[PDB]
Amino acid sequence: SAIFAERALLPEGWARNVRFEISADGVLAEIRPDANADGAERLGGAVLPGMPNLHSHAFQRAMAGLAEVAGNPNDSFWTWRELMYRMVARLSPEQIEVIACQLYIEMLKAGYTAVAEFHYVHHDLDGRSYADPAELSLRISRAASAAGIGLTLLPVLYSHAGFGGQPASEGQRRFINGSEAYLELLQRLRAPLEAAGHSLGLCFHSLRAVTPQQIATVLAAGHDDLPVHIHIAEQQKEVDDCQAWSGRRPLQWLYENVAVDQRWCLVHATHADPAEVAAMARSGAVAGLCLSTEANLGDGIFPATDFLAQGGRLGIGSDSHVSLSVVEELRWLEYGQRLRDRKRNRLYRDDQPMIGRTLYDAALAGGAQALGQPIGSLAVGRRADLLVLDGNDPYLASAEGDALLNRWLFAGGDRQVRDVMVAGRWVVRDGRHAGEERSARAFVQVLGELL
Amino acid sequence: SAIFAERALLPEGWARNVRFEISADGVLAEIRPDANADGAERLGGAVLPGMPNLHSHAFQRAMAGLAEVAGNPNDSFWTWRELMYRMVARLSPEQIEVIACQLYIEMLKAGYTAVAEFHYVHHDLDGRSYADPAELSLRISRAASAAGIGLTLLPVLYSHAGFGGQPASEGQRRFINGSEAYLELLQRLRAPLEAAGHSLGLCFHSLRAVTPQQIATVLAAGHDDLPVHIHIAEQQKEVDDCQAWSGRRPLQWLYENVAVDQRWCLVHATHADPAEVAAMARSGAVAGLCLSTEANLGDGIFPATDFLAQGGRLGIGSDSHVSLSVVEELRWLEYGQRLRDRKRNRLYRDDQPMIGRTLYDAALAGGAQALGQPIGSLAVGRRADLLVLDGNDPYLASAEGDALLNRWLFAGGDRQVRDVMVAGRWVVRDGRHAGEERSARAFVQVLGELL
Numbered sequence: 029s030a031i032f033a034e035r036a037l038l039p040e041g042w043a044r045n046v047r048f049e050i051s052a053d054g055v056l057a058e059i060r061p062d063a064n065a066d067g068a069e070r071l072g073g074a075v076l077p078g079m080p081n082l083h084s085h086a087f088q089r090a091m092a093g094l095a096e097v098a099g100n101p102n103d104s105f106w107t108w109r110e111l112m113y114r115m116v117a118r119l120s121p122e123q124i125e126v127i128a129c130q131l132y133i134e135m136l137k138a139g140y141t142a143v144a145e146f147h148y149v150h151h152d153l154d155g156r157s158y159a160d161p162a163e164l165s166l167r168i169s170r171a172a173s174a175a176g177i178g179l180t181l182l183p184v185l186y187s188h189a190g191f192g193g194q195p196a197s198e199g200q201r202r203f204i205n206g207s208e209a210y211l212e213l214l215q216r217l218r219a220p221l222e223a224a225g226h227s228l229g230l231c232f233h234s235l236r237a238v239t240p241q242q243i244a245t246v247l248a249a250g251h252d253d254l255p256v257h258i259h260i261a262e263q264q265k266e267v268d269d270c271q272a273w274s275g276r277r278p279l280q281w282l283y284e285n286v287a288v289d290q291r292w293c294l295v296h297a298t299h300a301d302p303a304e305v306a307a308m309a310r311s312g313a314v315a316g317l318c319l320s321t322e323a324n325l326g327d328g329i330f331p332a333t334d335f336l337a338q339g340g341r342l343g344i345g346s347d348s349h350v351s352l353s354v355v356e357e358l359r360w361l362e363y364g365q366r367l368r369d370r371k372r373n374r375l376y377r378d379d380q381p382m383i384g385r386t387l388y389d390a391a392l393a394g395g396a397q398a399l400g401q402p403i404g405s406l407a408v409g410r411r412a413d414l415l416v417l418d419g420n421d422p423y424l425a426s427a428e429g430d431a432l433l434n435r436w437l438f439a440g441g442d443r444q445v446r447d448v449m450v451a452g453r454w455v456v457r458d459g460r461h462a463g464e465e466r467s468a469r470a471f472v473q474v475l476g477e478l479l
Numbered sequence: 480s481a482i483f484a485e486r487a488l489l490p491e492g493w494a495r496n497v498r499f500e501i502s503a504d505g506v507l508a509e510i511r512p513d514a515n516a517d518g519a520e521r522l523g524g525a526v527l528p529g530m531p532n533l534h535s536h537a538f539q540r541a542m543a544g545l546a547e548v549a550g551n552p553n554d555s556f557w558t559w560r561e562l563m564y565r566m567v568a569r570l571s572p573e574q575i576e577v578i579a580c581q582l583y584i585e586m587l588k589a590g591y592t593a594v595a596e597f598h599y600v601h602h603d604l605d606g607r608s609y610a611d612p613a614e615l616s617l618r619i620s621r622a623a624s625a626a627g628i629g630l631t632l633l634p635v636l637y638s639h640a641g642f643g644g645q646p647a648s649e650g651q652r653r654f655i656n657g658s659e660a661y662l663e664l665l666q667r668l669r670a671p672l673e674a675a676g677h678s679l680g681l682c683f684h685s686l687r688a689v690t691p692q693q694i695a696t697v698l699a700a701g702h703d704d705l706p707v708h709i710h711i712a713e714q715q716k717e718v719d720d721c722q723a724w725s726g727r728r729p730l731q732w733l734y735e736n737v738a739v740d741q742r743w744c745l746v747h748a749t750h751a752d753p754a755e756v757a758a759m760a761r762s763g764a765v766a767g768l769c770l771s772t773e774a775n776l777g778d779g780i781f782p783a784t785d786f787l788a789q790g791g792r793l794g795i796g797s798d799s800h801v802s803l804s805v806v807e808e809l810r811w812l813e814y815g816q817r818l819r820d821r822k823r824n825r826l827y828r829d830d831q832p833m834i835g836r837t838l839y840d841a842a843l844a845g846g847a848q849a850l851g852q853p854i855g856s857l858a859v860g861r862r863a864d865l866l867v868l869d870g871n872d873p874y875l876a877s878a879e880g881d882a883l884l885n886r887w888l889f890a891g892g893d894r895q896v897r898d899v900m901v902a903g904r905w906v907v908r909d910g911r912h913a914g915e916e917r918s919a920r921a922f923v924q925v926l927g928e929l930l
């Protein structure tokens with residue numbers, strides 16, 4: 029197949045009259061700027077690479093917005109987490125699949141073309157395994173396929189309630205595997221994910237949930253071809269407990285004990301001191317920034333300006349899914365730095381003064397790296413994952429190049445995304461998804477069941 | 480005419496099956512819950528009072544998002560302001576009217592049903608008065624009428640470049656009036672605004688732009704019934720300069736020298752120290768918080784939790800119009816408090832633990848007070864300004880009462896606003912405004928002329 033764009037953001041920058049040839053397997057096979065359409069499909073607006081979503085817990089969308097009730101004068105991340113635990117205790121395999129389908133459809137409409145599902149709900153209601161231990165992982169994969177979104181599934185190793193190998197709590201019963209069972213599940217998933225065109229990654233929930241011994245064991249188990257994700261340094265309490273148990277801060281500890289490199293996505297990394305920021309940047313690991321969730325949970329503001337200045341790599345994740353908006357995450361990534369510094373125009377490069385373009389370039393690259401997928405740019409030999417903005421929008425139509433990105437990211441919104449393609453397949457057209465009605469009906473029923 | 484809502488937010492709380500009778504003048508004549516439809520038009524979702532927007536500079540929407548380019552390593556409010564001055568120097572009366580109409584249509588679609596236009600663009604390109612001195616004020620009124628939005632026009636007294644009566648800069652030439660001309664403008668405006676069903680307020684740009692004698696003179700002129708608005712304490716430099724000229728901070732100074740009370744809207748008030756916060760709350764003045772613009776400009780975070788705890792009244796304004804979203808302003812008012820305190824659930828009342836409802840209640844009340852209009856409440860005698868949320872949305876349909884406000888404000892977005900009524904007239908239906916097409920055509924042409 030082929031498509032033709034009056035305007036498109038290519039790796040070398042904005043181009044005009046670009047004809048893209050797309051192979052039968054959904055890969056960009058030829059890209060010719062300043063070309064004739066030559067039989068290709070007419071696109072309706074500015075074309076951008078699709079945005080990877082590098083961190084998701086799908087089921088949490090079912091409770092999004094419901095935890096905004098003061099139950100204490102100092103409501104915490106930890107009281108939120110207990111409510112989340114109560115939600116997860118109720119979910120059937122069928123409900124998990126329905127929620128994921130709805131969520132991924134909404135992600136696609138926002139311009140997220142691929143997702144890293146940080147998946148820790150493994151077992152049945154009593155913590156006992158399913159007949160097929162991969163049951164819930166397979167539901168996630170089936171949901172991604174139905175929506176048509178790219179997927180890196182990250183089954184999560186979760187074993188403990190806290191540092192020192194503290195026994196798992198009752199509320200964590202559905203998450204729990206030892207190292208051996210986890211490595212089995214991981215190996216078991218390779219074939220079905222591959223058959224669906226999906227990717228896999230290694231994942232430790234956090235330094236609270238797994239022991240140093242388990243990390244060492246898993247990293248030595250021969251899955252060197254996979255990304256590695258972990259929640260780290262999100263909350264001050266984790267920092268304090270790490271110090272108590274190890275004499276180090278969380279990121280400091282990880283870097284001292286593990287060969288962190290480009291395979292790694294460090295989710296949140298919120299409490300990173302200057303030495304930790306520098307170590308992250310040196311290593312080439314990707315900071316997984318989840319701006320809307322971090323604000324919602326009162327985590328704090330990441331030192332993004334310091335990190336970026338030193339060549340840090342980052343991407344964005346919707347995480348608890350209170351927000352599903354590429355616009356919101358990038359806008360408030362920048363705005364948070366502005367509020368902290370009380371200055372404007374914080375996140376730019378030495379070779380790129382445009383804020384919107386800086387943010388988009390950064391999150392594309394980091395997102396692609398964290399997912400371990402051939403995405404994040406419109407280049408020959410990368411997958412045909414793209415967005416088409418509204419060519420009829422007066423702001424976008426009057427803008428050119430990087431100014432168009434500024435209008436969208438800082439003055440516009442989600443509904444400026446009109447059409448979306450993933451793996452060379454049209455999955456959103458005129459803001460609508462072919463499965464949205466069926467999904468909404470199933471989803472509203474599930475929401476009722478969960479009350 | 481009559482409308483019927485299965486769910487509606489009334490002054491006493493959520494109600495069911497409410498029949499509204501609206502008189503010919505757009506005033507709520509009868510409201511009764513637990514009623515039958517009886518030929519009244521059945522509405523398509525949850526009904527809320529429309530949200531007043533208490534602070535706007537219409538023309539700024541034309542440059543929204545365009546000032547996101549790093550020029551300096553420490554770009555500031557002041558370098559932004561210079562770019563804004565360059566934009567304003569080019570605007571014709573026709574262009575101003577076109578931008579205002581487009582903006583107001585977008586406000587309506589977002590759920591803003593009335594706007595306070597803090598209007599300081601008065602004169603021609605060379606600073607000379609128009610044949611009718613009120614020309615540009617009239618363009619604003621005409622635009623609000625065309626869009627169908629409620630309007631409190633705040634013509635702005637602007638006379639100086641800084642404290643001490645510093646002569647106006649060349650860049651400020653279009654804004655400038657002495658006290659005599661300003662007081663004449665107010666009188667000229669009374670009849671046409673009344674004829675259009677619009678309101679009027681007194682307005683000082685800031686303590687930088689007018690002198691203490693000018694303030695006293697204007698306040699002694701007998702317009703004792705009008706709202707009084709002022710930008711105050713937005714930036715540190717204003718605080719420092721006020722201290723240098725008066726030995727006080729800006730808010731401290733105002734409260735020491737002027738009888739501030741319930742008529743007043745203090746826009747931004749960002750740099751309010753604890754004594755200043757207390758005096759604001761005691762006075763019953765409305766804090767005009769413009770969250771998206773304050774973040775965009777790097778102003779900082781208002782002490783909203785301290786203010787609210789003391790009975791403070793607030794409303795929201797879109798200001799520079801980088802964002803036109805009731806959702807975004809209320810959401811990030813709360814999230815800003817969460818990021819600062821590193822805690823959740825910050826803005827609630829002793830009698831209302833629901834965060835969304837607290838925010839909505841507050842901004843409705845402060846917004847109505849600040850505009851001086853009989854709005855912000857679905858009660859008999861108040862104007863029929865309302866929005867209808869999407870009853871087909873699965874998140875909203877599965878929720879009830881205050882939980883529905885939480886889903887919308889914290890998990891949803893603008894797209895969930897479907898129908899909007901102002902003065903008993905439908906101005907948005909199923910997300911569409913009748914003037915949108917003509918408006919966008921004219922607006923895109925203006926955007927081209929401004930480049």
Ligand SMILES: N=CN[C@@H](CC(=O)O)C(=O)O
Pocket residue numbers: 085109234259262321325347348
């Ligand atoms: N935002 C954090 N969420 C985490 C909580 C945790 O780290 O325990 C989670 O979903 O597992």
Ligand SMILES: N=CN[C@@H](CC(=O)O)C(=O)O
Pocket residue numbers: 536560685710713772776798799
């Ligand atoms: N956000 C601030 N804007 C103000 C600037 C000022 O106070 O000089 C204004 O548009 O007049």
Ligand SMILES: [Hg+2]
Pocket residue numbers: 125126129171174
């Ligand atoms: Hg499904």
Ligand SMILES: [Hg+2]
Pocket residue numbers: 129130174175463467
């Ligand atoms: Hg589905």
Ligand SMILES: [Hg+2]
Pocket residue numbers: 191235269270271273274276277278281
């Ligand atoms: Hg540790």
Ligand SMILES: [Hg+2]
Pocket residue numbers: 576577580581622625
């Ligand atoms: Hg107009």
Ligand SMILES: [Hg+2]
Pocket residue numbers: 580581625626914918
């Ligand atoms: Hg118009």
Ligand SMILES: [Hg+2]
Pocket residue numbers: 686720721722724725727728729732
């Ligand atoms: Hg002063």
Ligand SMILES: [Zn+2]
Pocket residue numbers: 083084085146259295347348
């Ligand atoms: Zn997470």
Ligand SMILES: [Zn+2]
Pocket residue numbers: 534535536597710746798799
């Ligand atoms: Zn303003």
